Amino acid sequence: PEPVLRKVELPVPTHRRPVQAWVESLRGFEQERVGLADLHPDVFATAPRLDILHQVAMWQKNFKRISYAKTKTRAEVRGGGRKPWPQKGTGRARHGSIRSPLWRGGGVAHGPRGPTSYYYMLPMKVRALGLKVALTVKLAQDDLHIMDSLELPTGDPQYLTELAHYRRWGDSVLLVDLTHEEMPQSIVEATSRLKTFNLIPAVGLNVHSMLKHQTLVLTLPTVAFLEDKLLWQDSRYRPLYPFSLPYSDFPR
Amino acid sequence: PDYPRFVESVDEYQFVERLLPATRIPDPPKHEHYPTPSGWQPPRDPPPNLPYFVRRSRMHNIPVYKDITHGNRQMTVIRKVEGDIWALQKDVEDFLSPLLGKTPVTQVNEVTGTLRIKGYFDQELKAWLLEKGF
Amino acid sequence: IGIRLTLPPPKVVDRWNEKRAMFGVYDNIGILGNFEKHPKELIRGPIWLRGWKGNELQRCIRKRKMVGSRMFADDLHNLNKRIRYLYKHFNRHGKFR
Amino acid sequence: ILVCPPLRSRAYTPPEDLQSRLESYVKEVFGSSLPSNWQDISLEDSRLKFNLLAHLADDLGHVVPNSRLHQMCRVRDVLDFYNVPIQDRSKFDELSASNLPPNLKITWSY
Amino acid sequence: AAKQFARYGAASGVVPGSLWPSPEQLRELEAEEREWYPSLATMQESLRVKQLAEE
Amino acid sequence: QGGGARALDLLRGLPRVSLANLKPNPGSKKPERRPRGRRRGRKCGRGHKGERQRGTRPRLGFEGGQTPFYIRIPKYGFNEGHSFRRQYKPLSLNRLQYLIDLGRVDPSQPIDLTQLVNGRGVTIQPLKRDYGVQLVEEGADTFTAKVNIEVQLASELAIAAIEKNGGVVTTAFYDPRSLDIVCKPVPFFLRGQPIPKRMLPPEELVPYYTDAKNRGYLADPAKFPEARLELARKYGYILPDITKDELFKMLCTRKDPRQIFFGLAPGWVVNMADKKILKPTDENLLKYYTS
Ligand SMILES: [Mg+2]
Numbered sequence: 021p022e023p024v025l026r027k028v029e030l031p032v033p034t035h036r037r038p039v040q041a042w043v044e045s046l047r048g049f050e051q052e053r054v055g056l057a058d059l060h061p062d063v064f065a066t067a068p069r070l071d072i073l074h075q076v077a078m079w080q081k082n083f084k085r086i087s088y089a090k091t092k093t094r095a096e097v098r099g100g101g102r103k104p105w106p107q108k109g110t111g112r113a114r115h116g117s118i119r120s121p122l123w124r125g126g127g128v129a130h131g132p133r134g135p136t137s138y139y140y141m142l143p144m145k146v147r148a149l150g151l152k153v154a155l156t157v158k159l160a161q162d163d164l165h166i167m168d169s170l171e172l173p174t175g176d177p178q179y180l181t182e183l184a185h186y187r188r189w190g191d192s193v194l195l196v197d198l199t200h201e202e203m204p205q206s207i208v209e210a211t212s213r214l215k216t217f218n219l220i221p222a223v224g225l226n227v228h229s230m231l232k233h234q235t236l237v238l239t240l241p242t243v244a245f246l247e248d249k250l251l252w253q254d255s256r257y258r259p260l261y262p263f264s265l266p267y268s269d270f271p272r
Numbered sequence: 273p274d275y276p277r278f279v280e281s282v283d284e285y286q287f288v289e290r291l292l293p294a295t296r297i298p299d300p301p302k303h304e305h306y307p308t309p310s311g312w313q314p315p316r317d318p319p320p321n322l323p324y325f326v327r328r329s330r331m332h333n334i335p336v337y338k339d340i341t342h343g344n345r346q347m348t349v350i351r352k353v354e355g356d357i358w359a360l361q362k363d364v365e366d367f368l369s370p371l372l373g374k375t376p377v378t379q380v381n382e383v384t385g386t387l388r389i390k391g392y393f394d395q396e397l398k399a400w401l402l403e404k405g406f
Numbered sequence: 407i408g409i410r411l412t413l414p415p416p417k418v419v420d421r422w423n424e425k426r427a428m429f430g431v432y433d434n435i436g437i438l439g440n441f442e443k444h445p446k447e448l449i450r451g452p453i454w455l456r457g458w459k460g461n462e463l464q465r466c467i468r469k470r471k472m473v474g475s476r477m478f479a480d481d482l483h484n485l486n487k488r489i490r491y492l493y494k495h496f497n498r499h500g501k502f503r
Numbered sequence: 504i505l506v507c508p509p510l511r512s513r514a515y516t517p518p519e520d521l522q523s524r525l526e527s528y529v530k531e532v533f534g535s536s537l538p539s540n541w542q543d544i545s546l547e548d549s550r551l552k553f554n555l556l557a558h559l560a561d562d563l564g565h566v567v568p569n570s571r572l573h574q575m576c577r578v579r580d581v582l583d584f585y586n587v588p589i590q591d592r593s594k595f596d597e598l599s600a601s602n603l604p605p606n607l608k609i610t611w612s613y
Numbered sequence: 614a615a616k617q618f619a620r621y622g623a624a625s626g627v628v629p630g631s632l633w634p635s636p637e638q639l640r641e642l643e644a645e646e647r648e649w650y651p652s653l654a655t656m657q658e659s660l661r662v663k664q665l666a667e668e
Numbered sequence: 669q670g671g672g673a674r675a676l677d678l679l680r681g682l683p684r685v686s687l688a689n690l691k692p693n694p695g696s697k698k699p700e701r702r703p704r705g706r707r708r709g710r711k712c713g714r715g716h717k718g719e720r721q722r723g724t725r726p727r728l729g730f731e732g733g734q735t736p737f738y739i740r741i742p743k744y745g746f747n748e749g750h751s752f753r754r755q756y757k758p759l760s761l762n763r764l765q766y767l768i769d770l771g772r773v774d775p776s777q778p779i780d781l782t783q784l785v786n787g788r789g790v791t792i793q794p795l796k797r798d799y800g801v802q803l804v805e806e807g808a809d810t811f812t813a814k815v816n817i818e819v820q821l822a823s824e825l826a827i828a829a830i831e832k833n834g835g836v837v838t839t840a841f842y843d844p845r846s847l848d849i850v851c852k853p854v855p856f857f858l859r860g861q862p863i864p865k866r867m868l869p870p871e872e873l874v875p876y877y878t879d880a881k882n883r884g885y886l887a888d889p890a891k892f893p894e895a896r897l898e899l900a901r902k903y904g905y906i907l908p909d910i911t912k913d914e915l916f917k918m919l920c921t922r923k924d925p926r927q928i929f930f931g932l933a934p935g936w937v938v939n940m941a942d943k944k945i946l947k948p949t950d951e952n953l954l955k956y957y958t959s
Pocket residue numbers: 111
C-alpha cells in the first residue's frame with residue numbers, strides 16, 4: 021500500500037514551512053496512518069486569533085436574526101380617545117387617555133417594535149480569516165483529522181459511532197465532503213441517523229459548526245478546496261464590481 | 273417580422289478579453305536593476321536569518337503605516353510581523369534611539385503581530401526594514 | 407405574594423436537534439461558492455427586512471414603501487401615524503442637536 | 504460480524520532500548536549510507552517520514568499527533584518525542600495515588 | 614430580455630435582432646442627436662463666430 | 669522563529685476552543701450606560717427644567733433669537749454650479765511609474781482608462797462628475813518608462829516627461845456615458861446593449877482637443893511634429909525618433925474619435941456567454957453607428 025502523500029498546490033511563503041497531518045481512512049477501524057498530507061501554513065498554522073473567532077461567531081449568530089417581538093404604543097391600543105375626566109375639580113390625577121402607559125391596559129412606552137432586523141456584514145476578509153483560524157485551532161489542539169475519502173464499509177451508524185469511540189474523536193464530529201452530490205452513499209446513510217455526527221459539503225463550512233462539534237473531519241479534496249478558496253482572499257485586488265460578474269482569472 | 277441582419281464573429285473577441293480585469297494582484301516583473309525607477313525593491317531571497325519576519329503586503333510593499341488620532345497623536349505601525357516581535361522592538365529601539373535622542377515609546381501587540389511607535393518614522397523604518405531583507 | 411411556591415416544569419433542551427446541529431451551515435456560501443450567492447440571500451423574513459437594517463423610523467418608512475399598498479387599512483393608518491410621530495421625535499426632540 | 508478493537512490505552516512508557524530500536528528503523532528506511540550522526544538525519548522527505556513514523560507507531564503503539572508532525576524535522580526530534588512518557592490515569596486515580604495524609608479523604612461520585 | 618441575452622447568450626432564447634433599435638426608434642435617436650449634439654464643424658464654426666465678436 | 673509558533677504550541681495544552689469560552693477583544697465592547705441607580709438615574713444626565721431637560725431646545729444654528737451666524741453672512745457663489753464642474757482624477761508620473769514597476773499596467777500595449785482602472789491605478793467616479801484622468805507632472809524627474817498613454821488632460825511638463833522617454837501621449841474626451849462604459853466594460857456588456865458612439869466634446873472643450881499643444885485626439889496630426897519639437901527645445905532634451913523604434917506600431921495606436929474600445933466598433937453586441945460578437949448589417953443601423 022503506497023502512502024497517500026499530499027503536497028500543497030499553492031506556493032508557500034519561503035520563510036514558512038508546511039504543517040502536516042496523518043491521512044486516515046474510514047474503511048476499517050484501525051485504518052489510521054494511510055498517508056501524510058502537507059497543509060498550507062497560512063491556512064492551517066495562522067496566528068491563533070480567538071478574538072476573530074468571537075467576531076465571526078457572533079456575526080453568524082446575529083446577522084440573520086429577525087426579531088418578531090412587538091408591542092402596541094399608546095397610539096395603537098383600542099379606544100382611549102377621550103379625556104377620562106375633567107382636568108380640574110375632581111381631586112383626581114389629571115389624565116388625557118385611558119391607554120397611557122401609566123394605565124393598566126395602556127400602551128407600552130418603550131417596548132419592542134418589530135419586526136426588527138439585525139443584519140450586518142463583517143468584511144469578507146475578516147470572514148475568510150475566521151475560517152482559517154478555526155482550522156488552525158482544530159489542528160493545533162488535535163481535533164482535526166484528514167481522511168482520503170468518507171467511504172464506509174457499511175452504512176450502519178453504529179459502525180461510525182464505534183469507530184469514533186475507538187479513535188477518540190469526541191462526542192460531536194463534523195464531516196466535510198467536497199460536494200453534496202458526490203458524497204458516498206454509505207456516509208450519507210450513517211450520518212442521517214445520527215445527531216452528533218454531522219455531514220456537510222465543503223461550501224457549508226463555518227466557524228459556528230466547527231466550534232459546536234469537537235472533532236473536524238476533512239477529506240483531502242476538501243483540504244485543497246479550502247486552501248484555494250481562503251488563500252485567494254490574501255492575494256486579491258480590491259474589487260471593481262461584485263466577484264459574481266466575469267473577471268479575467270475568476271473563477272479558477 | 274423583419275429584423276436587422278447581424279453576423280456573429282469570434283475573431284474580434286480577443287478585444288473583449290483585453291478588457292477584463294483580474295482579481296489577483298500580479299506578481300511584480302523581474303527587473304535588470306534594483307531599485308526600480310519608482311523605488312521598489314523585492315524582498316531578499318533567501319529570507320533574512322532573523323528571529324522575526326516582516327511579510328510584505330498584498331501589493332508587495334513594506335507594511336509600515338503612519339497613524340493619527342486626536343489630530344495630534346502621530347504614530348507609526350509596523351504590521352504583519354511573524355516570529356519574535358519583542359526582538360523587533362529592541363531593534364527598533366536601537367535604530368531610533370540615536371535619531372530621537374531617547375528610547376522610543378512603543379506598543380507591542382503580540383496578538384496581532386503589530387508594533388506601534390509614537391512619532392512619524394515611516395520613511396526611516398521603511399528604508400531600514402528594506403536593508404534587512406524584508 | 408408574587409413568588410411561585412413550586413418549581414416550574416423543568417426545561418429540557420436538545421442541543422443536537424437538526425436546527426441547532428446545522429446552524430450556520432452555508433454562512434460562507436459566497437466566499438466558498440465563488441460568490442454566486444450572498445449570505446444575505448439566506449435570510450428569511452419580511453420582504454422589507456431581508457439583508458437590511460435601520461432604526462424604527464427607517465423600518466417604518468421602508469415597510470410603507472414596499473408593502474404599504476398591500477397593508478390593511480387600520481394597519482396602514484397606524485403606520486402613517488407612527489412615521490409622523492417618529493418624524494417629530496427624531497427631528498425636533500432630544501438632548502443633542 | 505464486524506468487531507471494533509477494544510479501546511486502546513493512551514498510557515506510554517519509553518522502552519529502555521528505544522535508541523537502538525529507532526536506529527534499526529532509521530537504517531531500514533534511510534539505508535546504511537550515513538550511519539554516523541544518524542540522529543541528525545532530516546525528515547524533509549514525506550515518504551521517508553511516513554515510513555519512519557508509521558513504523559514507530561505500529562511498533563510502539565504511540566503515534567505522533569497532527570499538532571506535532573511538523574516539529575519532527577530530524578531524527579533527534581522523533582527520538583525526543585518517544586522519550587516522553589504518557590499517563591492515562593484519571594484525576595481521581597492520580598490524586599488517590601498521591602500519598603494522601605491519613606486525614607485527607609477523597610471521594611468520587613462520578 | 615436584453616439583460617437575459619447578455620447573461621446567458623443564445624441559451625436565453627432572445628432573437629438577437631431585437632437588440633438594436635427598430636426603424637422608428639432609430640429615427641428618434643437620430644433626431645435627439647441632431648437637436649442636442651452638433652457636428653464638429655458646427656461647433657468650430659460657432660467658436661469662430663463667437664471669437665470674432667469678443668475680439 | 670518565536671512568538672508565532674509559541675502560540676500554537678501553547679494552545680495544545682489548553683481546553684478546547686468552543687462556543688462556551690469565547691470573548692470579545694478587550695476594549696472592543698464599551699459598556700452601555702443606563703439611567704438606573706444613584707449615579708445615572710434621578711435626573712439622568714438631562715439637567716433641571718428649561719428646554720434641555722424637557723427635550724425641546726431649538727434647532728441647530730438657532731442662537732436664541734439673535735440673527736444667527738449662518739444667516740448674517742452674505743450669500744456668495746463659492747459653490748454655485750459645483751454640480752456641473754468637471755473633475756479629473758489626477759494621475760501622477762510617480763504613480764504611473766510605480767504601477768508599471770509593479771506590473772499592474774502593461775507599457776507594451778496602449779494605456780487608456782480601461783487599463784488604469786483594471787490595474788487599480790485610479791478610481792473613476794462618473795456619477796460624481798469625473799470626466800477622466802488628468803496626467804499631472806509630479807514625479808517627472810524620475811520617470812523613465814516609455815508608454816503610449818491616453819488621458820483626458822495633461823500638463824506640458826507631464827507631456828515632456830512622456831515624450832522625452834520616447835513615449836506618446838494623446839488627450840481624448842469621454843462623455844459621462846462613454847466614460848462609465850470605458851471604466852467598467854463588463855457591467856455594460858451585461859446590459860446587452862449595442863456599444864454606443866463616443867460623443868464629441870462640448871464647444872468649450874473643442875479648442876482643447878483640436879489643439880496639438882495638448883496632443884488633442886481631434887488635433888491635426890501634421891501639427892504634432894512641431895509641437896513635440898517645441899517642448900524638446902523648451903525643456904532641453906533631444907526628441908527621439910519613434911518611427912525608428914520597434915514598438916512604433918504600438919505607439920501609433922489610437923482609437924477612432926467615435927470609438928470607446930480598441931478593436932470594437934459602435935453598434936456591436938458583445939456576447940460574453942458564447943464569446944461571440946454580433947455586428948448589425950442593416951444599412952440604416954450601419955450608417956447610424958459610423959456617423
Ligand atoms: Mg384628595
